[PDB]
Point group: D2
């Protein structure tokens, strides 16, 4: 599972998720969004179930990106929540919440939701 | 903001979120849920906008917990996405996605959503 | 439950949700948002569990508003999903998804999520 | 758009969404889930932007189903929020919130979130 997660993945938008799974449940790496207020790589940190149910279930996981790096600050952060499923078409299936830093009038409209599917090719 | 975030926070359910904000946008610490399939502390990792808009906006952030530690494994992970707002009633306002590792029949029913409000007291 | 739901409710933002619960599980009425691209009343339609579990559980429900009326069109619709809980502090607790009509480039950023609490006073 | 919406649609799970779009922004029809605690048809009610932006944008919409009919009561309701996009591969792209009627201890775990893609074939 650690073997399976670690690597470079791509989502349907052409974004690039580069991750290492530590044996202790850690996720570390970089993210590059093909869309939005973003350019180049951004740090990411997250967690996964390092002793997943052996009954052929997926492995639960999450990570976060703060959309600040040396090129831009989009005053925002995305968390993806989902599962890794192994096999020859390996997948990370996620849903995500993007919160954007705001004042307390438009804070009702503070958070976007979506879904990303990450694969090992394309 | 780093000064303001670092500390112990409590949500409306009586859960305990202990966090350190690194100067580089890192969030590290522990989480203890008062509810669900959980006991004691669990590792957490996340990210925040370390150069937030000075126009009195909140600071965007996220973190993840994999619900595995030495006592239990709930085959699941929660990501909270939201903002920190300073002042004398400081708040972290979040929304969250809990994904539970599953087989590919009930995977439509894989993810819970909610909201947590974290304060410095109670 | 039909007795309890029907009426005028207010959310934390000062919005006004006026609803009739039909005996057949129907919800009909009007909504007026205190925020966003909106003014005056808008039609709403929805559904509730008209034979709720008698074990003191809440009653599940949803409704939709298309943000078009004779004054404005915000090219968008909100659905609230949640439960009605009776008693002397009666509550409808919801989460909501607002989708905004878009082209297929920004469609990743198409849907906002939030939560509203509706009460019988204020 | 009214012409385009009205009809029978299918989602990736094999569910059947039968809808009529009234000229006044109404959505009425039936839903049959291929999954979960459900069988046969259930009433649905919803709303759409009946004067959508002509700039080739999608048309915003929502609907609700209370999972009660003459065969079962699943003490729950789903709202789908999303957009209709016309053309020869017409699509309704949605996200959904399923709330399940509960007591006030597990109410933190009250709402599932997902996404459905509806097409005119299969
Ligand atoms: Ir297990
Ligand atoms: Ir999915
Ligand atoms: Ir999709
Ligand atoms: Ir700024
Ligand atoms: Ir909020
Ligand atoms: Ir709340
Ligand atoms: Ir029942
Ligand atoms: Ir709630
Ligand atoms: Ir709240
Ligand atoms: Ir327009
Ligand atoms: Ir989508
Ligand atoms: Ir999908």
């Amino acid at each position: 599972d650690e073997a399976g997660i670690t690597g470079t993945w791509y989502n349907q938008l052409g974004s690039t998720f580069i991750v290492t799974a530590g044996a202790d449940g850690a996720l570390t790496g970089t993210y590059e969004s093909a869309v939005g207020n973003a350019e180049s790589r951004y740090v990411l940190t997250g967690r996964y179930d390092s002793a997943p149910a052996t009954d052929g279930s997926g492995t639960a996981l999450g990570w976060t990106v703060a959309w600040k790096n040396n090129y831009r600050n989009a005053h925002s952060a995305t968390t993806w929540s989902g599962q890794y499923v192994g096999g020859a078409e390996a997948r990370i299936n996620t849903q995500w919440l993007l919160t954007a830093g705001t004042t307390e009038a438009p804070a009702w409209a503070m958070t976007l939701v979506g879904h990303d599917t990450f694969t090992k090719v394309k």
